Write a protein that binds this DNA or RNA. Structure first.
Ligand SMILES: Nc1ccn([C@H]2C[C@H](O)[C@@H](COP(=O)(O)OP(=O)(O)OP(=O)(O)O)O2)c(=O)n1
Ligand SMILES: [Ca+2]
Ligand SMILES: [Ca+2]
Length: 430
DNA sequence: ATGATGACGCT
DNA sequence: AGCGTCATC
Protein backbone atom coordinates (compact mmCIF):
# COMPACT_ATOMS: atom_id res chain seq x y z
CA UNK A 1 0.00 0.00 0.00
CA UNK A 2 2.35 2.78 1.26
CA UNK A 3 5.33 1.31 -0.70
CA UNK A 4 3.51 0.96 -4.05
CA UNK A 5 4.74 3.17 -6.90
CA UNK A 6 1.72 4.73 -8.70
CA UNK A 7 3.68 6.45 -11.52
CA UNK A 8 2.65 9.99 -10.62
CA UNK A 9 6.17 11.33 -10.40
CA UNK A 10 6.25 13.17 -13.76
CA UNK A 11 4.08 15.38 -15.93
CA UNK A 12 4.30 14.56 -19.63
CA UNK A 13 2.52 15.99 -22.64
CA UNK A 14 2.25 14.97 -26.25
CA UNK A 15 1.48 17.68 -28.80
CA UNK A 16 0.55 16.60 -32.31
CA UNK A 17 -0.53 18.87 -35.14
CA UNK A 18 -4.00 18.56 -36.66
CA UNK A 19 -4.03 17.32 -40.30
CA UNK A 20 -0.53 18.69 -40.47
CA UNK A 21 0.38 18.66 -44.18
CA UNK A 22 -3.10 19.94 -45.10
CA UNK A 23 -2.68 22.81 -42.62
CA UNK A 24 0.64 23.69 -44.30
CA UNK A 25 -1.00 23.81 -47.69
CA UNK A 26 -4.00 25.82 -46.39
CA UNK A 27 -1.85 28.46 -44.75
CA UNK A 28 -0.12 28.85 -48.15
CA UNK A 29 -3.28 28.80 -50.27
CA UNK A 30 -6.29 30.41 -48.46
CA UNK A 31 -8.63 28.84 -51.06
CA UNK A 32 -8.13 25.47 -49.26
CA UNK A 33 -9.23 26.73 -45.81
CA UNK A 34 -12.51 25.47 -44.29
CA UNK A 35 -12.90 22.96 -47.10
CA UNK A 36 -12.69 19.23 -47.61
CA UNK A 37 -9.19 18.88 -49.01
CA UNK A 38 -6.24 16.45 -49.05
CA UNK A 39 -2.52 16.32 -49.71
CA UNK A 40 -1.40 14.00 -52.49
CA UNK A 41 1.68 12.30 -53.93
CA UNK A 42 2.30 11.63 -57.64
CA UNK A 43 -0.73 12.76 -59.76
CA UNK A 44 -0.39 10.18 -62.58
CA UNK A 45 -1.43 6.91 -60.85
CA UNK A 46 -5.14 7.32 -59.99
CA UNK A 47 -4.90 11.04 -59.19
CA UNK A 48 -2.08 10.42 -56.70
CA UNK A 49 -2.11 8.68 -53.33
CA UNK A 50 -3.52 10.60 -50.33
CA UNK A 51 -1.17 11.25 -47.37
CA UNK A 52 -3.21 13.81 -45.38
CA UNK A 53 -6.95 14.65 -45.11
CA UNK A 54 -8.79 17.70 -43.72
CA UNK A 55 -11.47 17.17 -41.05
CA UNK A 56 -14.22 18.45 -43.41
CA UNK A 57 -13.07 15.79 -45.92
CA UNK A 58 -12.98 13.06 -43.23
CA UNK A 59 -16.75 13.59 -42.78
CA UNK A 60 -17.12 12.07 -46.32
CA UNK A 61 -15.00 8.95 -45.59
CA UNK A 62 -11.73 10.06 -47.19
CA UNK A 63 -8.69 8.43 -45.70
CA UNK A 64 -4.93 8.16 -46.02
CA UNK A 65 -3.68 5.42 -48.52
CA UNK A 66 -6.76 6.01 -50.70
CA UNK A 67 -6.17 7.09 -54.35
CA UNK A 68 -7.46 10.60 -55.11
CA UNK A 69 -9.78 9.33 -57.89
CA UNK A 70 -11.43 6.96 -55.49
CA UNK A 71 -11.47 9.78 -52.94
CA UNK A 72 -13.40 11.98 -55.44
CA UNK A 73 -16.19 9.39 -55.57
CA UNK A 74 -16.94 9.81 -51.86
CA UNK A 75 -16.42 13.57 -52.03
CA UNK A 76 -16.69 15.20 -55.53
CA UNK A 77 -15.90 18.71 -54.14
CA UNK A 78 -12.51 17.59 -52.65
CA UNK A 79 -9.62 19.96 -53.24
CA UNK A 80 -6.05 18.60 -53.56
CA UNK A 81 -2.62 20.07 -53.00
CA UNK A 82 0.31 18.11 -54.44
CA UNK A 83 3.59 17.36 -52.79
CA UNK A 84 6.51 19.16 -54.47
CA UNK A 85 8.34 16.72 -56.77
CA UNK A 86 12.08 17.22 -57.31
CA UNK A 87 13.95 14.43 -59.01
CA UNK A 88 11.03 12.41 -60.11
CA UNK A 89 10.49 12.03 -56.37
CA UNK A 90 8.46 13.61 -53.60
CA UNK A 91 10.27 16.39 -51.70
CA UNK A 92 9.02 17.03 -48.19
CA UNK A 93 11.10 20.12 -47.28
CA UNK A 94 8.03 22.36 -46.95
CA UNK A 95 6.69 20.17 -44.10
CA UNK A 96 10.14 19.78 -42.47
CA UNK A 97 10.59 23.55 -42.47
CA UNK A 98 7.03 23.91 -41.10
CA UNK A 99 7.85 21.39 -38.30
CA UNK A 100 10.96 23.34 -37.25
CA UNK A 101 8.68 26.38 -36.80
CA UNK A 102 6.65 24.29 -34.35
CA UNK A 103 9.52 22.54 -32.55
CA UNK A 104 11.36 25.81 -31.88
CA UNK A 105 8.31 27.35 -30.14
CA UNK A 106 7.75 24.20 -28.05
CA UNK A 107 11.49 24.21 -27.23
CA UNK A 108 10.93 27.54 -25.45
CA UNK A 109 8.82 25.95 -22.74
CA UNK A 110 10.56 22.72 -22.03
CA UNK A 111 13.09 20.33 -23.43
CA UNK A 112 11.28 18.26 -26.05
CA UNK A 113 11.57 14.85 -27.64
CA UNK A 114 10.78 15.19 -31.34
CA UNK A 115 8.77 12.01 -32.02
CA UNK A 116 7.76 12.64 -35.65
CA UNK A 117 7.57 15.51 -38.14
CA UNK A 118 4.40 16.85 -36.48
CA UNK A 119 4.70 15.62 -32.84
CA UNK A 120 6.92 16.07 -29.80
CA UNK A 121 6.73 14.83 -26.23
CA UNK A 122 7.30 17.31 -23.41
CA UNK A 123 8.42 16.80 -19.78
CA UNK A 124 6.79 19.52 -17.67
CA UNK A 125 7.66 18.36 -14.13
CA UNK A 126 10.04 21.30 -13.66
CA UNK A 127 7.89 23.95 -15.34
CA UNK A 128 4.90 22.83 -13.22
CA UNK A 129 6.86 22.94 -9.90
CA UNK A 130 8.37 26.31 -10.78
CA UNK A 131 4.87 27.57 -11.75
CA UNK A 132 3.23 26.17 -8.57
CA UNK A 133 5.52 28.46 -6.47
CA UNK A 134 4.51 31.46 -8.63
CA UNK A 135 0.76 31.00 -7.99
CA UNK A 136 0.21 31.93 -4.33
CA UNK A 137 -1.84 28.79 -3.56
CA UNK A 138 -4.55 30.56 -5.62
CA UNK A 139 -7.19 28.53 -7.48
CA UNK A 140 -7.11 27.64 -11.18
CA UNK A 141 -9.83 29.52 -13.05
CA UNK A 142 -11.67 27.54 -15.72
CA UNK A 143 -10.68 30.41 -18.00
CA UNK A 144 -7.08 29.18 -17.82
CA UNK A 145 -8.19 25.91 -19.50
CA UNK A 146 -10.57 26.96 -22.36
CA UNK A 147 -9.87 23.81 -24.50
CA UNK A 148 -9.16 21.10 -21.89
CA UNK A 149 -11.22 17.86 -21.43
CA UNK A 150 -10.91 15.79 -18.25
CA UNK A 151 -11.22 12.16 -19.31
CA UNK A 152 -14.02 10.40 -17.39
CA UNK A 153 -15.77 13.66 -16.31
CA UNK A 154 -18.50 14.65 -15.87
CA UNK A 155 -19.64 11.59 -13.88
CA UNK A 156 -22.13 11.10 -11.03
CA UNK A 157 -25.49 12.82 -10.29
CA UNK A 158 -26.76 20.30 -21.56
CA UNK A 159 -26.53 17.85 -24.49
CA UNK A 160 -24.02 19.73 -26.72
CA UNK A 161 -20.34 18.99 -26.44
CA UNK A 162 -18.85 22.23 -25.07
CA UNK A 163 -21.53 21.84 -22.35
CA UNK A 164 -20.10 18.53 -21.12
CA UNK A 165 -16.51 19.83 -21.44
CA UNK A 166 -17.20 22.62 -18.93
CA UNK A 167 -19.14 20.33 -16.59
CA UNK A 168 -16.28 17.85 -16.25
CA UNK A 169 -13.86 20.78 -16.02
CA UNK A 170 -15.79 22.39 -13.14
CA UNK A 171 -16.31 19.03 -11.38
CA UNK A 172 -12.57 18.47 -11.59
CA UNK A 173 -11.56 22.00 -10.60
CA UNK A 174 -14.10 22.14 -7.74
CA UNK A 175 -12.59 18.94 -6.31
CA UNK A 176 -8.95 20.16 -6.48
CA UNK A 177 -6.29 19.80 -3.72
CA UNK A 178 -4.72 23.32 -4.07
CA UNK A 179 -3.44 23.19 -0.42
CA UNK A 180 -1.16 20.22 -1.35
CA UNK A 181 1.82 20.99 -3.66
CA UNK A 182 2.76 17.38 -4.43
CA UNK A 183 -0.83 16.34 -5.31
CA UNK A 184 -0.37 14.73 -8.73
CA UNK A 185 -3.80 15.86 -10.01
CA UNK A 186 -2.95 19.48 -9.28
CA UNK A 187 0.30 19.00 -11.20
CA UNK A 188 -1.46 17.62 -14.29
CA UNK A 189 -3.75 20.66 -14.02
CA UNK A 190 -0.81 23.15 -14.01
CA UNK A 191 0.77 21.19 -16.84
CA UNK A 192 -2.50 21.58 -18.70
CA UNK A 193 -2.54 25.39 -18.27
CA UNK A 194 1.02 25.52 -19.66
CA UNK A 195 -0.02 23.42 -22.70
CA UNK A 196 -2.93 25.87 -23.34
CA UNK A 197 -0.16 28.49 -23.48
CA UNK A 198 2.14 26.43 -25.73
CA UNK A 199 -0.70 25.72 -28.11
CA UNK A 200 -1.91 29.33 -28.13
CA UNK A 201 1.70 30.32 -28.87
CA UNK A 202 1.99 27.78 -31.71
CA UNK A 203 -1.19 29.05 -33.36
CA UNK A 204 -0.47 32.77 -33.01
CA UNK A 205 3.06 32.34 -34.35
CA UNK A 206 2.26 29.82 -37.21
CA UNK A 207 -1.49 29.70 -37.74
CA UNK A 208 -1.34 25.95 -37.05
CA UNK A 209 -3.71 24.23 -34.66
CA UNK A 210 -2.94 21.10 -32.66
CA UNK A 211 -4.28 18.76 -29.99
CA UNK A 212 -2.48 17.58 -26.88
CA UNK A 213 -2.48 14.92 -24.18
CA UNK A 214 -1.34 15.59 -20.60
CA UNK A 215 -0.59 12.72 -18.21
CA UNK A 216 2.27 11.19 -16.11
CA UNK A 217 4.01 9.38 -18.94
CA UNK A 218 4.46 9.22 -22.72
CA UNK A 219 1.97 6.47 -23.41
CA UNK A 220 -0.97 8.06 -21.58
CA UNK A 221 -0.09 11.45 -23.02
CA UNK A 222 -0.16 9.92 -26.52
CA UNK A 223 -3.47 8.11 -25.87
CA UNK A 224 -5.00 11.21 -24.30
CA UNK A 225 -4.08 13.44 -27.22
CA UNK A 226 -6.29 11.35 -29.51
CA UNK A 227 -9.38 11.51 -27.31
CA UNK A 228 -10.54 15.01 -28.28
CA UNK A 229 -9.28 16.01 -31.71
CA UNK A 230 -9.18 18.46 -33.40
CA UNK A 231 -7.95 21.59 -31.69
CA UNK A 232 -8.53 20.45 -28.06
CA UNK A 233 -6.38 19.05 -25.21
CA UNK A 234 -7.11 16.18 -22.87
CA UNK A 235 -5.97 15.51 -19.29
CA UNK A 236 -5.72 11.78 -18.39
CA UNK A 237 -5.17 11.45 -14.63
CA UNK A 238 -4.05 8.35 -12.74
CA UNK A 239 -7.62 7.84 -11.37
CA UNK A 240 -9.34 7.86 -14.77
CA UNK A 241 -7.21 4.93 -15.92
CA UNK A 242 -9.19 1.89 -14.69
CA UNK A 243 -12.36 3.02 -16.45
CA UNK A 244 -10.46 4.33 -19.50
CA UNK A 245 -8.57 1.04 -19.87
CA UNK A 246 -11.57 -1.20 -19.05
CA UNK A 247 -12.92 -0.74 -22.59
CA UNK A 248 -9.72 0.47 -24.29
CA UNK A 249 -8.72 -1.99 -27.04
CA UNK A 250 -5.14 -3.11 -26.47
CA UNK A 251 -4.13 -2.09 -30.06
CA UNK A 252 -4.74 1.57 -29.21
CA UNK A 253 -1.71 1.62 -26.88
CA UNK A 254 1.64 2.66 -28.35
CA UNK A 255 3.81 -0.37 -29.30
CA UNK A 256 0.80 -2.76 -29.11
CA UNK A 257 -0.62 -1.74 -32.49
CA UNK A 258 1.40 -4.52 -34.23
CA UNK A 259 2.16 -8.27 -33.67
CA UNK A 260 3.19 -8.24 -29.95
CA UNK A 261 -0.27 -6.83 -29.23
CA UNK A 262 -1.87 -9.40 -31.53
CA UNK A 263 -0.24 -12.18 -29.48
CA UNK A 264 -1.27 -10.60 -26.17
CA UNK A 265 -4.81 -11.00 -27.41
CA UNK A 266 -4.28 -14.53 -28.84
CA UNK A 267 -2.25 -15.92 -25.85
CA UNK A 268 -4.17 -14.36 -22.94
CA UNK A 269 -7.59 -14.39 -24.66
CA UNK A 270 -8.43 -10.76 -23.73
CA UNK A 271 -9.63 -7.64 -25.71
CA UNK A 272 -8.97 -4.59 -23.50
CA UNK A 273 -6.09 -2.96 -21.77
CA UNK A 274 -7.52 -3.34 -18.20
CA UNK A 275 -7.74 -7.12 -18.44
CA UNK A 276 -3.90 -7.27 -18.13
CA UNK A 277 -4.10 -6.39 -14.37
CA UNK A 278 -5.27 -9.96 -13.56
CA UNK A 279 -1.81 -11.31 -14.51
CA UNK A 280 1.40 -11.46 -12.49
CA UNK A 281 4.64 -9.84 -13.64
CA UNK A 282 6.17 -13.38 -13.78
CA UNK A 283 3.23 -14.72 -15.90
CA UNK A 284 3.51 -11.85 -18.35
CA UNK A 285 7.29 -12.24 -18.54
CA UNK A 286 6.93 -15.98 -19.18
CA UNK A 287 4.72 -15.16 -22.22
CA UNK A 288 6.27 -12.04 -23.74
CA UNK A 289 9.79 -11.92 -22.23
CA UNK A 290 11.18 -10.08 -19.22
CA UNK A 291 11.23 -6.58 -20.71
CA UNK A 292 7.71 -6.78 -22.16
CA UNK A 293 6.22 -8.61 -19.18
CA UNK A 294 7.41 -5.92 -16.80
CA UNK A 295 6.44 -3.06 -19.08
CA UNK A 296 2.99 -4.66 -19.66
CA UNK A 297 2.52 -5.32 -15.92
CA UNK A 298 3.07 -1.63 -15.13
CA UNK A 299 1.37 -0.17 -18.25
CA UNK A 300 -2.09 -1.64 -17.63
CA UNK A 301 -1.96 0.06 -14.18
CA UNK A 302 -1.08 3.34 -15.98
CA UNK A 303 2.59 3.17 -15.03
CA UNK A 304 5.37 3.62 -17.61
CA UNK A 305 8.91 4.87 -16.98
CA UNK A 306 10.19 5.59 -20.54
CA UNK A 307 11.77 9.05 -20.46
CA UNK A 308 11.23 12.18 -22.56
CA UNK A 309 14.55 12.22 -24.36
CA UNK A 310 16.16 15.58 -24.98
CA UNK A 311 16.46 15.41 -28.79
CA UNK A 312 14.97 18.13 -30.99
CA UNK A 313 16.91 16.85 -34.07
CA UNK A 314 16.87 13.58 -36.07
CA UNK A 315 19.60 10.96 -35.74
CA UNK A 316 19.38 9.71 -39.35
CA UNK A 317 18.64 11.42 -42.69
CA UNK A 318 17.42 9.45 -45.68
CA UNK A 319 15.71 9.27 -49.07
CA UNK A 320 13.83 6.35 -50.58
CA UNK A 321 12.11 5.65 -53.85
CA UNK A 322 9.85 2.71 -54.64
CA UNK A 323 9.64 1.31 -58.17
CA UNK A 324 6.57 -0.94 -58.01
CA UNK A 325 5.42 -3.50 -60.62
CA UNK A 326 6.29 -2.70 -64.28
CA UNK A 327 8.58 0.17 -63.25
CA UNK A 328 11.21 -1.89 -61.35
CA UNK A 329 14.78 -1.09 -62.39
CA UNK A 330 16.45 -3.71 -64.68
CA UNK A 331 19.47 -1.95 -66.21
CA UNK A 332 22.61 -0.83 -64.36
CA UNK A 333 22.34 2.32 -66.45
CA UNK A 334 19.19 3.41 -64.51
CA UNK A 335 20.24 2.06 -61.10
CA UNK A 336 23.10 4.60 -61.36
CA UNK A 337 20.69 7.33 -62.34
CA UNK A 338 18.29 6.86 -59.41
CA UNK A 339 21.16 6.39 -56.91
CA UNK A 340 22.37 9.72 -58.31
CA UNK A 341 18.99 11.41 -57.87
CA UNK A 342 18.69 10.12 -54.28
CA UNK A 343 22.29 11.07 -53.47
CA UNK A 344 21.65 14.54 -54.87
CA UNK A 345 18.64 15.21 -52.57
CA UNK A 346 20.61 13.71 -49.66
CA UNK A 347 23.52 16.02 -50.21
CA UNK A 348 21.13 19.00 -50.44
CA UNK A 349 19.66 17.91 -47.09
CA UNK A 350 23.05 17.03 -45.50
CA UNK A 351 24.84 20.35 -46.26
CA UNK A 352 21.87 22.25 -44.82
CA UNK A 353 22.01 20.10 -41.73
CA UNK A 354 25.76 20.80 -41.35
CA UNK A 355 25.33 24.59 -41.31
CA UNK A 356 22.10 24.60 -39.30
CA UNK A 357 23.04 22.08 -36.63
CA UNK A 358 26.86 21.95 -36.50
CA UNK A 359 27.17 18.21 -37.19
CA UNK A 360 28.37 15.95 -39.96
CA UNK A 361 27.16 12.40 -40.75
CA UNK A 362 29.84 9.67 -41.05
CA UNK A 363 28.12 6.51 -42.33
CA UNK A 364 26.04 5.82 -45.44
CA UNK A 365 23.53 3.05 -45.28
CA UNK A 366 22.41 1.74 -48.64
CA UNK A 367 19.31 -0.40 -48.75
CA UNK A 368 17.49 -1.93 -51.68
CA UNK A 369 14.66 -4.29 -52.55
CA UNK A 370 14.28 -6.84 -55.33
CA UNK A 371 11.12 -7.97 -57.14
CA UNK A 372 9.11 -10.78 -55.46
CA UNK A 373 10.46 -10.26 -51.94
CA UNK A 374 7.62 -8.66 -49.86
CA UNK A 375 9.77 -7.28 -47.00
CA UNK A 376 10.42 -3.46 -46.77
CA UNK A 377 14.15 -4.21 -47.29
CA UNK A 378 15.79 -7.17 -48.99
CA UNK A 379 19.33 -6.16 -47.97
CA UNK A 380 21.15 -3.25 -46.30
CA UNK A 381 24.87 -2.36 -46.45
CA UNK A 382 26.94 0.45 -44.86
CA UNK A 383 30.03 2.29 -46.11
CA UNK A 384 32.02 5.36 -45.05
CA UNK A 385 30.49 8.76 -45.63
CA UNK A 386 33.61 10.85 -46.05
CA UNK A 387 32.17 13.76 -48.14
CA UNK A 388 28.89 15.48 -48.97
CA UNK A 389 29.18 14.77 -52.73
CA UNK A 390 26.22 13.18 -54.48
CA UNK A 391 28.34 11.62 -57.25
CA UNK A 392 30.69 9.99 -54.70
CA UNK A 393 27.93 8.70 -52.41
CA UNK A 394 25.96 7.32 -55.38
CA UNK A 395 29.11 5.74 -56.77
CA UNK A 396 29.96 4.28 -53.31
CA UNK A 397 26.36 3.15 -52.98
CA UNK A 398 26.64 1.41 -56.33
CA UNK A 399 30.00 -0.23 -55.46
CA UNK A 400 28.35 -1.59 -52.29
CA UNK A 401 25.70 -3.32 -54.51
CA UNK A 402 26.69 -5.44 -57.56
CA UNK A 403 27.20 -8.74 -55.82
CA UNK A 404 23.35 -8.91 -55.64
CA UNK A 405 22.98 -8.49 -59.42
CA UNK A 406 22.67 -12.09 -60.66
CA UNK A 407 23.11 -11.05 -64.32
CA UNK A 408 25.80 -12.79 -66.39
CA UNK A 409 24.68 -10.41 -69.17
CA UNK A 410 26.55 -7.23 -68.27
CA UNK A 411 24.37 -4.25 -69.32
CA UNK A 412 21.24 -5.59 -67.53
CA UNK A 413 20.27 -5.95 -63.89
CA UNK A 414 18.66 -9.13 -62.50
CA UNK A 415 16.48 -9.48 -60.58
CA UNK A 416 14.85 -6.05 -60.90
CA UNK A 417 14.98 -3.51 -58.02
CA UNK A 418 11.63 -2.52 -56.43
CA UNK A 419 13.21 0.08 -54.08
CA UNK A 420 16.32 2.17 -53.45
CA UNK A 421 17.03 3.73 -50.00
CA UNK A 422 20.11 5.81 -48.97
CA UNK A 423 20.52 7.08 -45.44
CA UNK A 424 23.09 9.23 -43.61
CA UNK A 425 23.94 8.23 -40.06
CA UNK A 426 26.62 8.07 -37.29
CA UNK A 427 26.49 11.84 -36.80
CA UNK A 428 29.35 13.71 -35.12
CA UNK A 429 29.97 17.33 -33.90
CA UNK A 430 31.21 19.88 -36.51
C1' DA B 1 0.31 0.12 -57.06
C1' DT B 2 0.17 4.31 -51.12
C1' DG B 3 4.93 5.96 -50.92
C1' DA B 4 8.30 8.23 -47.92
C1' DT B 5 10.06 8.46 -43.83
C1' DG B 6 12.39 7.69 -38.91
C1' DA B 7 13.35 5.27 -33.95
C1' DC B 8 14.75 1.35 -31.57
C1' DG B 9 15.42 -3.80 -30.31
C1' DC B 10 17.47 -8.34 -31.12
C1' DT B 11 21.34 -10.96 -32.40
C1' DA C 1 26.85 -5.28 -38.60
C1' DG C 2 22.36 -6.52 -40.56
C1' DC C 3 17.80 -7.77 -40.02
C1' DG C 4 12.88 -6.87 -37.96
C1' DT C 5 9.18 -4.14 -35.60
C1' DC C 6 6.50 -0.11 -34.81
C1' DA C 7 4.50 4.15 -35.98
C1' DT C 8 3.31 7.62 -38.82
C1' DC C 9 7.99 11.13 -40.34
N1 LIG D 1 1.52 7.26 -43.25
C1 LIG D 1 1.74 8.60 -43.21
C2 LIG D 1 1.34 9.26 -42.06
C3 LIG D 1 1.53 10.63 -41.93
N2 LIG D 1 2.09 11.34 -42.93
C4 LIG D 1 2.29 12.80 -42.81
C5 LIG D 1 1.06 13.54 -43.30
C6 LIG D 1 0.40 14.05 -42.05
O1 LIG D 1 -0.17 15.32 -42.28
C7 LIG D 1 1.53 14.14 -41.04
C8 LIG D 1 1.18 13.80 -39.61
O2 LIG D 1 0.48 12.56 -39.59
P1 LIG D 1 -0.51 12.13 -38.41
O3 LIG D 1 -0.57 10.62 -38.50
O4 LIG D 1 -0.15 12.94 -37.19
O5 LIG D 1 -1.98 12.65 -38.87
P2 LIG D 1 -2.35 14.12 -39.41
O6 LIG D 1 -1.54 15.13 -38.70
O7 LIG D 1 -2.45 14.12 -40.93
O8 LIG D 1 -3.84 14.27 -38.86
P3 LIG D 1 -4.29 13.99 -37.33
O9 LIG D 1 -3.00 13.77 -36.59
O10 LIG D 1 -5.07 15.26 -37.00
O11 LIG D 1 -5.19 12.78 -37.42
O12 LIG D 1 2.48 13.17 -41.45
C9 LIG D 1 2.47 10.66 -44.10
O13 LIG D 1 2.99 11.31 -45.03
N3 LIG D 1 2.30 9.32 -44.22
CA1 LIG E 1 -1.09 14.87 -36.58
CA1 LIG F 1 1.58 12.70 -35.49
Amino acid sequence: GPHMATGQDRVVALVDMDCFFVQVEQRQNPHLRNKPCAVVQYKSWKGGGIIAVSYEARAFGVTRSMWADDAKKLCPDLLLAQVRESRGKANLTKYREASVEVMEIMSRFAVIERASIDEAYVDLTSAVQERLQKLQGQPISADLLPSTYIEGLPQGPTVQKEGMRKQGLFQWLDSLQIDNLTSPDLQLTVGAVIVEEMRAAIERETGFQCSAGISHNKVLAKLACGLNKPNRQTLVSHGSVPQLFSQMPIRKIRSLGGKLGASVIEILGIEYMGELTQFTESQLQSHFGEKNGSWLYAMCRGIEHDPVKPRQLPKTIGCSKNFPGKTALATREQVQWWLLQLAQELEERLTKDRNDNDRVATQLVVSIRVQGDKRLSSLRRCCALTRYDAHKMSHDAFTVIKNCNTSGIQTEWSPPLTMLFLCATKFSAS
